[PDB]
Ligand binder design. Structure first.
Ligand SMILES: [Mg+2]
Ligand SMILES: [Mg+2]
Ligand SMILES: [Mg+2]
Ligand SMILES: [Mg+2]
Ligand SMILES: [Mg+2]
Ligand SMILES: [Mg+2]
Ligand SMILES: [Mg+2]
Ligand SMILES: [Mg+2]
Ligand SMILES: [Mg+2]
Ligand SMILES: [Mg+2]
Ligand SMILES: [Mg+2]
Ligand SMILES: [Mg+2]
Ligand SMILES: [Mg+2]
Ligand SMILES: [Mg+2]
Ligand SMILES: [Mg+2]
Ligand SMILES: [Mg+2]
Ligand SMILES: [Mg+2]
Ligand SMILES: [Mg+2]
Ligand SMILES: [Mg+2]
Ligand SMILES: [Mg+2]
Ligand SMILES: [Mg+2]
Ligand SMILES: [Mg+2]
Ligand SMILES: [Mg+2]
Ligand SMILES: [Mg+2]
Ligand SMILES: [Mg+2]
Ligand SMILES: [Mg+2]
Ligand SMILES: [Mg+2]
Ligand SMILES: [Mg+2]
Ligand SMILES: [Mg+2]
Ligand SMILES: [Mg+2]
Ligand SMILES: [Mg+2]
Ligand SMILES: [Mg+2]
Ligand SMILES: [Mg+2]
Ligand SMILES: [Mg+2]
Ligand SMILES: [Mg+2]
Ligand SMILES: [Mg+2]
Ligand SMILES: [Mg+2]
Ligand SMILES: [Mg+2]
Ligand SMILES: [Mg+2]
Ligand SMILES: [Mg+2]
Ligand SMILES: [Mg+2]
Ligand SMILES: [Mg+2]
Ligand SMILES: [Mg+2]
Ligand SMILES: [Mg+2]
Ligand SMILES: [Mg+2]
Ligand SMILES: [Mg+2]
Ligand SMILES: [Mg+2]
Ligand SMILES: [Mg+2]
Ligand SMILES: [Mg+2]
Ligand SMILES: [Mg+2]
Ligand SMILES: [Mg+2]
Ligand SMILES: [Mg+2]
Ligand SMILES: [Mg+2]
Ligand SMILES: [Mg+2]
Ligand SMILES: [Mg+2]
Ligand SMILES: [Mg+2]
Ligand SMILES: [Mg+2]
Lengths: 158, 134, 259
RNA sequence: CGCGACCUCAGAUCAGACGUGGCGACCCGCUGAAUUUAAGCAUAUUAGUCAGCGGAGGAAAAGAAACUAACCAGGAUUCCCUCAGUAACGGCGAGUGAACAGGGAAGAGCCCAGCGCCGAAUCCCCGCCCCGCGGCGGGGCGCGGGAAAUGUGGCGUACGGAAGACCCACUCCCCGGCGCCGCUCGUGGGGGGCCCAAGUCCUUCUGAUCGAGGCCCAGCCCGUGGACGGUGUGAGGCCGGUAGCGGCCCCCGGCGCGCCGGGCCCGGGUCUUCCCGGAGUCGGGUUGCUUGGGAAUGCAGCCCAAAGCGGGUGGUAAACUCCAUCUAAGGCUAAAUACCGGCACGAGACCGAUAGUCAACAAGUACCGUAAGGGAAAGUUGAAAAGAACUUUGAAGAGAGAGUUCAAGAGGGCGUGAAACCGUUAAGAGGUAAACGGGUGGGGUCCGCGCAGUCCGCCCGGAGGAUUCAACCCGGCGGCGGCCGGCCGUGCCGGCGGUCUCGGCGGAUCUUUCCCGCUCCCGGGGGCGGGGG
RNA sequence: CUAACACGUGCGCGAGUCGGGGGCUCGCACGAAAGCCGCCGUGGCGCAAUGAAGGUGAAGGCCGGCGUCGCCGGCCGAGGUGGGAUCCCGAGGCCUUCCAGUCCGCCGAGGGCGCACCACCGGCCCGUCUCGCCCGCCGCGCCGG
RNA sequence: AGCCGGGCGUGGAAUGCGAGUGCCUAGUGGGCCACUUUUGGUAAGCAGAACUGGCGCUGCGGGAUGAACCGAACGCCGGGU
RNA sequence: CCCAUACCCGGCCGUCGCUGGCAGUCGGCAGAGCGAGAAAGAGAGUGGCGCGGACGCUACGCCGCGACGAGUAGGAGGGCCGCUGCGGUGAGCCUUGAAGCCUAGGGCGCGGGCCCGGGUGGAGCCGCCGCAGGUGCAGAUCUUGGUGGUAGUAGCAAAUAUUCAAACGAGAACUUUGAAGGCCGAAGUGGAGAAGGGUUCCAUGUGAACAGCAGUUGAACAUGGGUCAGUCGGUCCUGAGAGAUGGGCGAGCGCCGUUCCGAAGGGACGGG
RNA sequence: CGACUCUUAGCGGUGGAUCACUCGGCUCGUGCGUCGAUGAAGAACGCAGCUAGCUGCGAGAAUUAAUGUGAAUUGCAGGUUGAUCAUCGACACUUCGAACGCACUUGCGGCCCCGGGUUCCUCCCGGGGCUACGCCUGUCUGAGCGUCGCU
């Protein structure tokens, strides 16, 4: 029954809510396990970036956020083709690729092309056979200074 | 302080393990220190007790300077019996009184091949530990 | 308690008649536990009143600024001899209670070196007090792995771990803390302020970078500064016994006028 | 009629395989209430919940758009925060109630049918030979058998693909066996086994010490070990252990290296020519259920029933008209996520035998019911049985002596041993039931360790006795104050100020003197990103 | 006991505030704690209201330039009345041998500036009604102000 | 009618007393009795109203006894009335 | 003349008010006041020996004046009231005796309660500053367990009936033997089975518990024994009926159906 | 005075409270995450020198082998080339039970191969191995006035 004055409330506890209750007592253990798995994978992929493949520049698709810039799912085929990267080789050399994304404009396409060219200029590629290098490869002296980098590769800035 | 997460410090768990340890863990548990001469000779501090080692009783109503040969080791009751420690009951028959090995010191050991193997292993491990500690 | 404790049975009240107290009773059977009263907090066996639930609000959150304020207050109070002594620590021989030693002790490796250092710094009396205080806990906490209790000893604040922790680990009552990760729970044992602390030179140097000065913000924290003083000159004795305030006072009426 | 194919369908204790049932905490597919709320009650709500049925795994399910959006656009699934108790539904009452975007955890993409091209180029099984065979595989030989053209394999799938020509690149990848070396995250993977410091030191309590005191000047000894447990109370140093990138032994794995054998002949760009898709399905009507989905969100039955610049979606029904975005009716796919069952562990501001699981114990036991099913009570001698020899009365139970023990004031349901209730002893009292409040009196048990009554200064007088007062000297220490230096300021002013830079941090202040890279322009002009001043 | 809401109280910061989710910290006796993130403040609440919606969206007061000013400048700046704790001023007034003559402090008629808060009168923003005229242009209109 | 400015204090009946204002809020929503007034009823310790005071929530002295009558309301005590 | 808890005077407790007073403990470096009817300076200035003096003030403290004190439902405050556990702290207590329990002992507090002495007991416990709660019982025809009066009472009364002697034995109304008198009266209180019971059967022994008195006795307890089949039954047949396959239905575990929508014979004289 | 009743205390009963103990629970977290026709889960019956229950085990029956360990188990007896414990990879594992020859009384069969009678000539006795349903691939034997081809 209503008291003198107050707010009308509609608590959503008319079901058997006490049977479906999610306590969070395993939150620190979950964080510890996720960390351990993260470092385990980082050790597993020895010189490769810990974060993963590079990703592209995208604009948020809304009037509320279209002024901001995200990290996308993957580079699209138009950008790869105009940057001279094969769609199959990009994935195995570290470029995230998706075929769904289109390119309505040219500024975003050119920005991502610049990103891919910078990534090619920056990455160090190990020999396919440790004894004999190949033409499309990096020379031996800079292999000694190849290290994992933390965080996303070439982080997105607004 | 214990840091190993896989070994417990719970009182009830420890007591349960102690009171239901199997016989080959009972042998380990009922160990008693060696005398000073034996300790200096073998570079070993403690030894599980055997059937016919002799003993000095250090604590209890029967403490004294009498060397006594163990007659048998009752592992179920966590007790050893010494041929001299004993008391007479009502009818006059004499029964052995139980003494815990922890309150017991060996005068000299029964040198069996397994015993000397154990002694040499203990001495070697202790010596390598000390050398590492150097 | 278990979610189904006390409800494992199947019982119905006999109802009006039978000259019984109208409570659910274990139904049927040739057993002592038959027609005995199953549910309800008043029955033997049966359910508790308002069973405790695992989703009680066990944890609390405190503002980061408030945590930093508490840490700063504890650190400031640790530097006053009166408060440290009132905490019970024996420091009458300590040469200077903001005790600072060089970074050489940061590389100690053996407990004997740590004990010798404490003896030299005359803090061994606190350790002896801890040894004397080691006793047996009272109550049911004994059978719950809280068998032994003892007094808190001094804290040691370091900057790098180079065997420092191993060296002072075994001495009872000593609490080791990194200078970059202090916690109030160990800085002010009990909620009482003024624990005896021993600093290293590097930690003492890093303190004002950690918490900033009055005119310089903290470099290691994003944006933090020391809390502002509500009153600066807290010498009430002066504030009364100064001429400029004593001048503007009426004469003190101090003659009693009894009935 | 007979003989022979193929089709369709039978029979087998034919050769070789596979399924059933259980558990079911978590998961998937169905079916599916009424208590209750609405202060009545039928729609609603409870609730797509309980109960019922089926089917799995170590996770399951979902999943690479017939998507979201309308923006300068995002881009598989799953999970958390937020959107949000919002849009919306609702006798518009009670109540119910999502999604997109945004930030994160994780992150992985692929394959057929069809369309076509390759002498079916494909697959299964039997016999012999060679290899190892405890996850029945590899190679060869069989005018061995069968499947399959009513279509097996290679290329190939919406991100286009194929073929031909021309340029460029142009070969080590995988598998079946064998051996070798080293390494294995925090510590070198996992598992198992065996070991590694220091007092029973000197006195003293005790029934028993793990108690109390001491152990010099190395403040007993160890300590990377002062967690815990046991041992006749209370133990870092008696014992097991504990700490330790400590030691030794055995077994299994993963990663690299080498050898033999087997398969594999493979790519990129430009130009020319061809080809390209899933039907009783979509969609429409109606009915019923469901959803926040409202002129119908989703599912299903029935009836109608397609098209190829087509079809679906664009949250109000309809016609016209442009736009936007996907490509349905075929398939696979780890991680983040869930876990009151199971195995093995760790812990706790929890309970402490009427509590905590029903169950600390021969507990789902005894016992009840024809059955479905219901379901208890019950821990503690003592450090050690040392568990009371022996004498005596009695038929015996049961006693008196004696004895063990620190204690039988612990005697086998024996730690402690309360109350209700009872026996006896002592004291007192008694015909208005007893008990009670206020005020005294009387008698008692104990207490004051009462029973010649307090102490404390300052004097006066008398009997004594001291290494004795004041004042000085020497040395030290402290307090207070005024000259020399020093430190600090939650104060100010200046300097040509500062490791090379002539310090750092920050700035929504500038930089045709700046420099570098990128793009546009025919070595040159302009813009953008970074560095410099 | 949990969740929600309201109000009162205590603390921190303050036009801001808050890491609750995640991550970094050699994971791990305590510690499943504690610290840190700042280009992890996404986001929540607050800083703006009103209208069903399309939408709109929170002062103005004086002088010189054409009072019977069109209209540019010079300015000044977020009202007014009453009551208002405190503060400012201050006619006068606070003593002793007298007398001249000060300093410092207290008193005090009246008079000021008036906090918060209350009441009242104006003003501004959004919806709606009545009246009436004027102005702007890339598209002079069922336009906009 | 509203505005400004100015002048008038013998504070214009007695008596008594500090006042104003704002939040949050429990219990209650069966009443009964008495003098006086009063409706229905033959009447009632009946039923129904108005004013005031009580009882309920309240003990104390008196009415022998007593929810309401008369006196008087209460911390633990001594004296007086 | 008598007396109420009313009134007057006094003491004490508490509450409320004065939003009362006290930092002035200003000392041989000093001068001891701000109670006194009258708003405000014991005002500052310039000219005509003996070394000495109580308490205080946990300011959340101490001190002084007045008034007042009923209370159900209900509201609020303070508890150096109490229980359990946690973080601090008491160089706390304790086998030269902790917890708990008992007491005609000594006391404190308005009270919640508490502190000592004595006894029993045998291993842990408490004070203070904080934190947390499964935190205080006279009742609920409360739950479980225990114990009373009733009360040595109701009662040990359905079916005619027992007596003598001996033996055993501690012990005899109840056992055993002998004798006598009785009953069942062949539709039995007799002799055998089915169902059900499951060792109750038999021998020996015991007399703790049970057999509502007792027992030398027992269907009690304790040791041992005991059920022999071609022909006696089961086993086979089918009855009323039950129930697979084929088939049908069913979301499904499954259900219907028993000759019905079935290629339903695995047999045989003989001959080759 | 005596009895009875009442009150208080001492002692003794009755009872089992309180306190102190705890090889038990409850809750949270971690790693793993595995049954079955090669016969599961469950049930029954048996197995110890003295053994009823609990526990363990399966006619090899409180356990065999193997490995580790190294002198016991124990309530009483008896007797290092390895006692006892632990681990567990070899072996074994009665009757029911999805339960499988048919049925559920443990009743009744059928086929094949061995040992007793025989000296296979058949019965009879004992032993061993098969004999469930559905379904897949292949094999064999078939059926059809189903579609055909030669005579
Ligand atoms: Mg209410
Ligand atoms: Mg270790
Ligand atoms: Mg319970
Ligand atoms: Mg206690
Ligand atoms: Mg109702
Ligand atoms: Mg109803
Ligand atoms: Mg309904
Ligand atoms: Mg529904
Ligand atoms: Mg269910
Ligand atoms: Mg199944
Ligand atoms: Mg499985
Ligand atoms: Mg899956
Ligand atoms: Mg696709
Ligand atoms: Mg999405
Ligand atoms: Mg909101
Ligand atoms: Mg309505
Ligand atoms: Mg719903
Ligand atoms: Mg989203
Ligand atoms: Mg990420
Ligand atoms: Mg094909
Ligand atoms: Mg000692
Ligand atoms: Mg040791
Ligand atoms: Mg619905
Ligand atoms: Mg529309
Ligand atoms: Mg498709
Ligand atoms: Mg698909
Ligand atoms: Mg799938
Ligand atoms: Mg832990
Ligand atoms: Mg108890
Ligand atoms: Mg007991
Ligand atoms: Mg005793
Ligand atoms: Mg007892
Ligand atoms: Mg008497
Ligand atoms: Mg309210
Ligand atoms: Mg009336
Ligand atoms: Mg009243
Ligand atoms: Mg009254
Ligand atoms: Mg009368
Ligand atoms: Mg009087
Ligand atoms: Mg008075
Ligand atoms: Mg009162
Ligand atoms: Mg008493
Ligand atoms: Mg004890
Ligand atoms: Mg509790
Ligand atoms: Mg009671
Ligand atoms: Mg009688
Ligand atoms: Mg008969
Ligand atoms: Mg007979
Ligand atoms: Mg008989
Ligand atoms: Mg009898
Ligand atoms: Mg015969
Ligand atoms: Mg049937
Ligand atoms: Mg008595
Ligand atoms: Mg047996
Ligand atoms: Mg063996
Ligand atoms: Mg062996
Ligand atoms: Mg039969």
């Amino acid at each position: 029954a209503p008291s003198r004055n107050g707010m009308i409330l509609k608590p959503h506890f008319h079901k058997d809510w006490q049977r479906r209750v999610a306590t969070w007592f395993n939150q620190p253990a979950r964080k510890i396990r996720r960390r351990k798995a993260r470092q385990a994978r980082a050790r597993r992929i020895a010189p490769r970036p810990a974060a993963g493949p590079i990703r592209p520049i995208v604009r948020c698709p809304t009037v509320r956020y279209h002024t901001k810039v995200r990290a996308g799912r993957g580079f699209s085929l138009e950008e790869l083709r105009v940057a001279g990267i094969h769609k199959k080789v990009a994935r195995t050399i570290g470029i995230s690729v998706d075929p769904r994304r289109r390119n309505k404009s040219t500024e975003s396409l050119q920005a991502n092309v610049q990103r891919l060219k910078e990534y090619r200029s920056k990455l160090v590629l190990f020999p396919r056979k440790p004894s004999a290098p190949k033409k499309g490869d990096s020379s031996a002296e800079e292999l000694k200074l190849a290290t994992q980098l933390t965080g996303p590769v070439m982080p997105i800035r607004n | 302080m214990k840091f190993n997460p896989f070994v417990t410090s719970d009182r009830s768990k420890n007591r349960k393990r102690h009171f239901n340890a199997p016989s080959h863990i009972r042998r380990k548990i009922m160990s008693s220190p060696l005398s000073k001469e034996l300790r200096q000779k073998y570079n070993v501090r403690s030894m599980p007790i055997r059937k016919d080692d002799e003993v000095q009783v250090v604590r209890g109503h029967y403490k004294g300077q009498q060397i006594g040969k163990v007659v048998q080791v009752y592992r179920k009751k966590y007790v050893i019996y010494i041929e001299r420690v004993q008391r007479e009951k009502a009818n006059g028959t004499t029964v052995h009184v139980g003494i815990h090995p922890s309150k017991v010191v060996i005068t000299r050991l029964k040198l069996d091949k397994d015993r000397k193997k154990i002694l040499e292993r203990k001495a070697k491990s202790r010596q390598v530990g000390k050398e590492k500690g150097k | 308690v278990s979610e189904l404790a006390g409800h494992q049975t199947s019982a119905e009240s006999w109802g009006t008649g039978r000259a019984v107290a109208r409570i659910p009773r274990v139904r049927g059977g040739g057993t002592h536990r038959s027609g005995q009263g199953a549910f309800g907090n008043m029955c033997r066996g049966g359910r508790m009143f308002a069973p405790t639930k695992t989703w009680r609000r066990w944890h609390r959150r405190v503002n980061t600024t408030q945590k930093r304020y508490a840490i700063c207050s504890a650190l400031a109070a640790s530097a006053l001899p009166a408060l440290v002594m009132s905490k019970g620590h024996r420091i009458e021989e300590v040469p200077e209670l903001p005790l600072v030693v060089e970074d050489k002790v940061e590389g100690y490796k053996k407990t004997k070196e740590a004990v010798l250092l404490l003896k030299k710094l005359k803090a061994w009396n606190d350790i002896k007090k801890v040894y004397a205080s080691q006793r047996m806990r009272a109550g049911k906490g004994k059978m719950r792995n809280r068998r032994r209790i003892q007094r808190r000893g001094p804290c040691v604040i370091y900057n790098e771990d180079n065997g420092i922790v191993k060296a002072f680990r075994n001495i009872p009552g000593i609490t080791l803390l990194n200078v970059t990760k202090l916690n109030i729970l160990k800085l002010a044992p009990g909620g009482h302020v003024g624990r005896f602390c021993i600093w290293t030179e590097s930690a003492f140097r890093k303190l004002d970078d950690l918490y900033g000065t009055w005119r310089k913000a903290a470099s290691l924290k994003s944006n933090y500064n020391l809390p502002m003083h509500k009153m600066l000159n807290t010498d009430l004795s002066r504030i009364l016994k100064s001429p400029e305030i004593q001048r503007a006072l009426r004469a003190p009426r101090k003659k009693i006028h009894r009935r």
